[PDB]
Amino acid sequence: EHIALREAIRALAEKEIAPYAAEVDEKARFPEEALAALNSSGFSAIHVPEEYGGQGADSVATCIVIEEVARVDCSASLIPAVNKLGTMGLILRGSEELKKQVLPAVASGEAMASYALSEREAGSDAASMRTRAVADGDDWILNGSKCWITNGGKSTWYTVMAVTDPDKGANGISAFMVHKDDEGFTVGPKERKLGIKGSPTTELYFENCRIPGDRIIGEPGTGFKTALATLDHTRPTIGAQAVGIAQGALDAAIAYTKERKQFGRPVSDNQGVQFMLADMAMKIEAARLMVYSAAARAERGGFISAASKCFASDVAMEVTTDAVQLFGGYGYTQDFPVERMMRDAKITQIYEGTNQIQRVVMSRALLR
Amino acid sequence: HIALREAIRALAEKEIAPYAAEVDEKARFPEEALAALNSSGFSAIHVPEEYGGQGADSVATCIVIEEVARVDCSASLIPAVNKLGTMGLILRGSEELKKQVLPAVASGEAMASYALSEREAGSDAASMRTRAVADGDDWILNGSKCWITNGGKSTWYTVMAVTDPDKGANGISAFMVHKDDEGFTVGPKERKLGIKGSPTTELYFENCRIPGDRIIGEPGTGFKTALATLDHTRPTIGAQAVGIAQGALDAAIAYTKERKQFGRPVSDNQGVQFMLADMAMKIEAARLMVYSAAARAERGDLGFISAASKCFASDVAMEVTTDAVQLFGGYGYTQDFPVERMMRDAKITQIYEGTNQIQRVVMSRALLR
Amino acid sequence: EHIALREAIRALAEKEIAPYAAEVDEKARFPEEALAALNSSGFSAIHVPEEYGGQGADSVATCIVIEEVARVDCSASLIPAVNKLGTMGLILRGSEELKKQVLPAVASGEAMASYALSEREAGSDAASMRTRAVADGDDWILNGSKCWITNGGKSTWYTVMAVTDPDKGANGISAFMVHKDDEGFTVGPKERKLGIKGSPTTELYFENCRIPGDRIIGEPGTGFKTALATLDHTRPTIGAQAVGIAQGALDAAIAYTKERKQFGRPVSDNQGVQFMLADMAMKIEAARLMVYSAAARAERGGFISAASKCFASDVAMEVTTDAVQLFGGYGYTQDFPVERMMRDAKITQIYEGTNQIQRVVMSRALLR
Amino acid sequence: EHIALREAIRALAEKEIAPYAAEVDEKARFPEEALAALNSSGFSAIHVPEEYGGQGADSVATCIVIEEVARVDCSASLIPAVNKLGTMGLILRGSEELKKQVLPAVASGEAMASYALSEREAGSDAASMRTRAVADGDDWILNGSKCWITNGGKSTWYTVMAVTDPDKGANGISAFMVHKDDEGFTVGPKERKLGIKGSPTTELYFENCRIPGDRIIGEPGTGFKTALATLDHTRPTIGAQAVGIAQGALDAAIAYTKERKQFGRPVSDNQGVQFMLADMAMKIEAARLMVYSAAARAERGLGFISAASKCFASDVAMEVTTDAVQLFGGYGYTQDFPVERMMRDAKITQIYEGTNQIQRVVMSRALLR
Numbered sequence A, C: 001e002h003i004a005l006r007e008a009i010r011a012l013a014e015k016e017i018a019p020y021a022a023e024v025d026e027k028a029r030f031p032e033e034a035l036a037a038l039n040s041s042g043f044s045a046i047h048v049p050e051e052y053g054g055q056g057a058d059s060v061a062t063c064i065v066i067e068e069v070a071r072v073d074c075s076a077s078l079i080p081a082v083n084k085l086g087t088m089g090l091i092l093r094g095s096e097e098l099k100k101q102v103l104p105a106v107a108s109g110e111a112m113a114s115y116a117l118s119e120r121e122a123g124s125d126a127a128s129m130r131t132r133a134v135a136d137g138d139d140w141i142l143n144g145s146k147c148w149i150t151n152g153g154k155s156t157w158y159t160v161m162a163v164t165d166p167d168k169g170a171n172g173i174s175a176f177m178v179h180k181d182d183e184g185f186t187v188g189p190k191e192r193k194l195g196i197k198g199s200p201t202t203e204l205y206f207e208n209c210r211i212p213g214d215r216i217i218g219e220p221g222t223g224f225k226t227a228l229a230t231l232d233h234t235r236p237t238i239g240a241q242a243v244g245i246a247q248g249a250l251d252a253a254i255a256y257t258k259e260r261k262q263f264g265r266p267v268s269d270n271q272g273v274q275f276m277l278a279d280m281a282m283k284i285e286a287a288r289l290m291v292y293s294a295a296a297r298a299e300r301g302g303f304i305s306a307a308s309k310c311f312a313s314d315v316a317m318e319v320t321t322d323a324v325q326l327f328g329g330y331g332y333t334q335d336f337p338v339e340r341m342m343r344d345a346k347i348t349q350i351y352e353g354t355n356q357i358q359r360v361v362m363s364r365a366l367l368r
Numbered sequence B: 001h002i003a004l005r006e007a008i009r010a011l012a013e014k015e016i017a018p019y020a021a022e023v024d025e026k027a028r029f030p031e032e033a034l035a036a037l038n039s040s041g042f043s044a045i046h047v048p049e050e051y052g053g054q055g056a057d058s059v060a061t062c063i064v065i066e067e068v069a070r071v072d073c074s075a076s077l078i079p080a081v082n083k084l085g086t087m088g089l090i091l092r093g094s095e096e097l098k099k100q101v102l103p104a105v106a107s108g109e110a111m112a113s114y115a116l117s118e119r120e121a122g123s124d125a126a127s128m129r130t131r132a133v134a135d136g137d138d139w140i141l142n143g144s145k146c147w148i149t150n151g152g153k154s155t156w157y158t159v160m161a162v163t164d165p166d167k168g169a170n171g172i173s174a175f176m177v178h179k180d181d182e183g184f185t186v187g188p189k190e191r192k193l194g195i196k197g198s199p200t201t202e203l204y205f206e207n208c209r210i211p212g213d214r215i216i217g218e219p220g221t222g223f224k225t226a227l228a229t230l231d232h233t234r235p236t237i238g239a240q241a242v243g244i245a246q247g248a249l250d251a252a253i254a255y256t257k258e259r260k261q262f263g264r265p266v267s268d269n270q271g272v273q274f275m276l277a278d279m280a281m282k283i284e285a286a287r288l289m290v291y292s293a294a295a296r297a298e299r300g301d302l303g304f305i306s307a308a309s310k311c312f313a314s315d316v317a318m319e320v321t322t323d324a325v326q327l328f329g330g331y332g333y334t335q336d337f338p339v340e341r342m343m344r345d346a347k348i349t350q351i352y353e354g355t356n357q358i359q360r361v362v363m364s365r366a367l368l369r
Numbered sequence D: 001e002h003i004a005l006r007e008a009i010r011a012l013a014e015k016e017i018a019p020y021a022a023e024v025d026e027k028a029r030f031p032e033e034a035l036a037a038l039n040s041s042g043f044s045a046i047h048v049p050e051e052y053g054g055q056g057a058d059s060v061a062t063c064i065v066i067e068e069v070a071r072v073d074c075s076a077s078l079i080p081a082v083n084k085l086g087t088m089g090l091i092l093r094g095s096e097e098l099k100k101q102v103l104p105a106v107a108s109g110e111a112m113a114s115y116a117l118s119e120r121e122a123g124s125d126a127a128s129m130r131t132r133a134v135a136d137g138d139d140w141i142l143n144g145s146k147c148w149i150t151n152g153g154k155s156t157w158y159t160v161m162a163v164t165d166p167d168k169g170a171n172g173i174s175a176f177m178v179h180k181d182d183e184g185f186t187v188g189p190k191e192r193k194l195g196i197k198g199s200p201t202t203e204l205y206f207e208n209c210r211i212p213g214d215r216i217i218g219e220p221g222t223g224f225k226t227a228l229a230t231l232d233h234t235r236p237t238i239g240a241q242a243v244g245i246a247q248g249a250l251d252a253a254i255a256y257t258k259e260r261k262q263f264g265r266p267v268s269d270n271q272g273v274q275f276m277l278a279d280m281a282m283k284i285e286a287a288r289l290m291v292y293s294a295a296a297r298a299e300r301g302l303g304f305i306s307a308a309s310k311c312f313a314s315d316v317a318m319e320v321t322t323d324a325v326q327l328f329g330g331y332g333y334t335q336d337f338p339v340e341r342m343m344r345d346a347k348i349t350q351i352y353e354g355t356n357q358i359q360r361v362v363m364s365r366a367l368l369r
């Protein structure tokens, strides 16, 4: 049934998404065509449970959607990937009352969700965040700022971490759902980036941002716990994204090298090139299987998830650098897509925990 | 599958691991492993149940090979070569011939070898020179083979020989040869880098007459059957490599936690932590791709995935075992610890059942199809 | 002596080139400030012999100039690197009469030179070029086109290879000096590129382009020999450029990781980060030494030059990918330069012969 | 001068050393033929200053000798590499009076020297050594033990580090010349090893080993400082050894792949093989140039470059020798050819004279200073 799912999303991606991926990048503009196609086909947030009108897709299927979209446009693949990132905490730990306000809109395609953890002085060290939430009667008052927020300015709902008790450290962070129209909440300017150019990446500001008491996810002081829980059920989807990029770059190189002739023969006739292609495909398949395994394990209940994400992203970086190479001069131009794929691949090694952090998680598990 | 793993690991750690050092040091057959594998029925679990076998699925067979290789790679070649030396027969042999051979392999009474390579026909196996000529209702084998794993310990041998020099690879046939067939002899063993205890021998055929029913499938399909065999066996060498790497990593985690320099375990250093993470991450990717390739082989382009799984796992093992020696420091460079042997053993996995260059030829041909 | 030279070029590069490098990339425009500073300091073409008013510098000194410029702006470094690429053939084999017309202007900074070998269907396989030259009276008539031409539209002089006898293969190719003002010579559109964005990269067209008989370089039929000789004396300079990029990336990462704190300490206090920095610096220094050795050997009169170029560029691709990684999220933005350095490093593996071609060259020598 | 030196050592090594290398390794016995030839040709310790009867060769020339010996026999290359390691401290910091006693014998080939720093609990963390030296009138009494000692049992002179003040940490360590005939000094059993098998690698024991006051190198408490300075001047020579091993591996692979024919053509006719050969040679030359640069700078008047030269070259040798075994296929995995031994030998170069993890500590400290 994943065979059929893959055929469906690939057909959708190639027809409605792929033709605009070069513009989305070149012009650094939101992938609107992709959003419309994902929303109307119901592929924008398949992970949302059926109870809220979602597909209730299993975790492997969700990875397959992200991977197949990323295979033609990595900025577009951040629509389903951050929809998951921005709703996973709520799903796992949120109250039914809160879930009902948010999930049906994400499930139906009416709203996107973003995830707001990071701050200028708190990236890898997320627990040193400075944004705070102070109770005030029935409300929470948010003050501070966040940065690196994917789909900032396009999302309707934001999962936002803030300090509710500074003296409890990691155990004094809470998570809140913030709506875009909430007073005191503003979206900052977009970053200029190496790749995923069309994906808006913004600062956010909270100046006495008053939100209802029902917006808190779980008990106060459980926000960091929830952040870690979020990442366990999302890191493989960034692995799936890296796998898709890699696959698209390999697909392009195979097609091009077969058709491009030098020395009176296809450049793919040269065993140096054949071996490079083999190495790219071998590692992509290994990375894909570890992604799916990590995803299936997460669903059923740190090592495998960090591994799947670290490995697939390392693989995508090598594969896309090789794919640019196999096109020769044309690979270095915007006329072909592999140049964009290479710039996009680099982010997968950085967000949803840097690959150095993934190695920290992995080694801690091995050595415990 | 978990219960299988627990059972084979216990046997390997209890009955095989204590002899692994001496197996290598003396370059002598792992007899203790053979007795334990044979009597607990772990030596050839792939043989179909119709012939007295466990009829285990191909992933189960990989897990057995992997868990044995984790403690002794020479020993792992008992089940791995039991499979190599019977797979052609299982795939393409007649009931009449299968019934003669497989029950003894199924029971642990007989090991099987696979005799394909010659001095001048390694990668280019189709250029082999050993001949088979039809005589009445018999075949007369003349020639020699080399690099034959478990040579001199095996009872049954799958031998390829030319039936028609004119027909190229379409003029190769495959035959089951028995240790007691007259004019069949075993030559000297190779002096090797690793898997030192696995006998690796030449074989001689001197007017070696065998019954006509010994042929596997039709005359001239022997190379085709050789290629199909590798499709179904390449992942098991992947599994072997995964096992070796796992054992090297297990030894390095245990040792780096215990060994202290500068007032703390050597594992306390982030450079060592990252290297351990790299080892484990890559081992798990290799493992999953081995099991996937095995699952797909059993169900019926296995070409790409089986070559991939063998090539990647063996590359991973080489890197992991090189690292594990490194993590022990000077002790890792001594025979006092097993990681030195593990490194030496890991190297063969990149070479046999198709060198990793040949694996890349198979993979790229599939992609460029 | 070279120490003094390195100090001078570095000071020049820091003060007059570096402040414009971001803008040169972001606006994809020619590094005009770098041109003015290099021309007036006399750093634009120091390889030109003294006989023509040039500096007459040794080949290592030329590499150090290219390296130190590439350390702050790769597009800018193509000024001296392609001034060299576009005059070496002439210098090695051209008549005195021809050299007197071209070289003094390049030496004085009045003219830039370009090198025009490649065509759409003749890249790695340059010998299959289709641009034609036909003798007509005392002149040559050139017809056809070239592409990938660095500094196209900015150069005054172009070294152009063309077929003079179609039946002689590589031995029926000649090389000619073409002047930007020659009738029937026109410059095409600029490529849109992954990196080195400010370096113009253009098609050229020859439409009954009539040039004097004195424009041929050496004897008819020796043009390809002269192209191969050029690469022998230029490939180490692309190694030098890749060393420069890598060094700038490493300088950046050292400065940033010392100042950026997470978990209460500089990120450079992590041993994984320390080891990565050690790896970058070790490979850079190996690459640098092999470049200078190739340069010294070429100048005193295939393997070492191909090795110096392949190795340094593979190193720079690795080092710049790591430098982006070590800046974390900031590395992925245009606010810092490591992202530009990564995009730029990729070209070094492709031009003046792809690293695959370099391995053809090397293995042929080993196996001779 | 260097072109000629290289030619002279290469010819000597090919004639007098190469023919014995396989036996030295296989039988784990000292390379006696190489010692005799290096001694009588005057190549055993060319770094020794002219003032003590030595050749007084520059540091690049000393690397070239070590490199070209290592190219055919790594164990034999440890004669001049360790003759340098076990005298450099003395040369740099010792009194004229002591130098005159030790250096002429090393210069003339009458004596080998060893370096005795490491202990079972003091490897990377050498400053935590436990061997003590106690003053007794004008003399010193040594008590403790060393391990990992190359050429132990063969050397005549040993540079030994010992604690002279347990309260001063690293500044409580001293260095002493110990003679093989000093009473209370004994040599323990040899390690069994992955490679450099013919190189003796021993424990040493000091039991009330009384030595004269003139045997101390430099002032008391500066022995560890002397250890660090020594490594600055010797690390490139292990880079040079790794470069020789890799060069021998590459040379062997070139000659072999050109002559081994499969599929109707030399195996070197395949581009995947050509490219690997190209990668091997390119990295070897980069490694060589950095070693010579490191050596040349050490001589002139260094932390970063000596560590980089050794780390890079040893990493290169490990990759290159793993590749060279691969390129021989089956034959590479056998003792019939030398690439298997070269592979085993390469591994030590990443470990001794400071592991490559320690080299990265040293490099990164210099970068972040």
Ligand SMILES: Cc1cc2c(cc1C)N(C[C@H](O)[C@H](O)[C@H](O)COP(=O)(O)OP(=O)(O)OC[C@H]1O[C@@H](n3cnc4c(N)ncnc43)[C@H](O)[C@@H]1O)c1[nH]c(=O)[nH]c(=O)c1N2
Binding pocket: A114, A115, A116, A117, A118, A120, A122, A123, A124, A125, A147, A148, A149, A150, A151, A193, A201, A347, A350, A351, A352, A353, A354, A355, A356, A357, A360, C260, C261, C262, C263, C267, C270, C272, C273, C325, C326, C327, C328, C329, C330, C332
């Ligand atoms: C385009 C884009 C998009 C997103 C994001 C980033 C970017 C660039 N992120 C933020 C992302 O998760 C974040 O960038 C990483 O956690 C890394 O943090 P810093 O950028 O602060 O680097 P930081 O300063 O943490 O790291 C600097 C370098 O040091 C290394 N390092 C740090 N600690 C180390 C340690 N203990 N050991 C070894 N090395 C260590 C790092 O690996 C890195 O190489 C995000 N966030 C969010 O909340 N919502 C979002 O939607 C997104 N989306």
Ligand SMILES: Cc1cc2c(cc1C)N(C[C@H](O)[C@H](O)[C@H](O)COP(=O)(O)OP(=O)(O)OC[C@H]1O[C@@H](n3cnc4c(N)ncnc43)[C@H](O)[C@@H]1O)c1[nH]c(=O)[nH]c(=O)c1N2
Binding pocket: A260, A262, A263, A267, A270, A272, A273, A325, A326, A327, A328, A329, A330, A332, C115, C116, C117, C118, C120, C122, C123, C124, C125, C147, C148, C149, C150, C193, C201, C347, C350, C351, C352, C353, C354, C355, C356, C357, C360
């Ligand atoms: C920005 C920029 C700037 C310049 C240039 C290019 C670019 C992109 N070049 C042209 C450059 O030298 C050219 O891109 C390369 O020679 C490769 O040619 P193709 O782009 O046609 O790739 P091509 O189609 O040759 O190669 C495609 C792939 O096949 C591989 N391949 C080809 N043959 C192979 C073989 N036999 N064995 C193994 N692999 C093989 C290649 O390595 C590559 O990965 C140039 N030119 C010029 O005349 N003047 C200039 O100034 C410049 N400058």
Ligand SMILES: Cc1cc2c(cc1C)N(C[C@H](O)[C@H](O)[C@H](O)COP(=O)(O)OP(=O)(O)OC[C@H]1O[C@@H](n3cnc4c(N)ncnc43)[C@H](O)[C@@H]1O)c1[nH]c(=O)[nH]c(=O)c1N2
Binding pocket: B114, B115, B116, B117, B119, B121, B122, B123, B124, B146, B147, B148, B149, B150, B192, B200, B348, B351, B352, B353, B354, B355, B356, B357, B358, B361, D260, D262, D263, D267, D270, D272, D273, D326, D327, D328, D329, D330, D331, D333
């Ligand atoms: C210990 C041991 C155990 C066994 C075996 C070997 C060994 C060493 N073998 C034999 C094994 O399968 C054989 O060694 C390989 O197929 C390679 O053949 P050669 O050793 O002749 O190397 P060969 O000479 O074919 O290869 C030499 C080098 O050239 C490369 N090469 C060759 N052709 C190439 C091409 N077209 N493109 C790129 N590169 C190419 C190879 O990759 C290798 O690097 C075997 N056999 C058997 O019948 N029964 C058994 O039980 C075993 N077991």
Ligand SMILES: Cc1cc2c(cc1C)N(C[C@H](O)[C@H](O)[C@H](O)COP(=O)(O)OP(=O)(O)OC[C@H]1O[C@@H](n3cnc4c(N)ncnc43)[C@H](O)[C@@H]1O)c1[nH]c(=O)[nH]c(=O)c1N2
Binding pocket: B259, B260, B261, B262, B266, B269, B271, B272, B326, B327, B328, B329, B330, B331, B333, D115, D116, D117, D118, D120, D122, D123, D124, D125, D147, D148, D149, D150, D193, D201, D348, D351, D352, D353, D354, D355, D356, D357, D358, D361
């Ligand atoms: C054959 C042979 C020959 C010689 C030598 C060894 C051998 C095997 N040695 C000793 C050698 O120098 C010694 O093995 C190394 O210094 C490493 O010490 P240990 O073996 O105790 O490993 P140790 O236990 O120190 O290291 C184990 C692992 O931990 C790692 N590690 C340790 N500290 C670390 C840190 N701070 N950060 C990151 N990683 C760290 C190491 O890199 C290694 O990977 C020697 N000695 C001598 O005195 N005279 C001699 O002649 C020779 N000869």
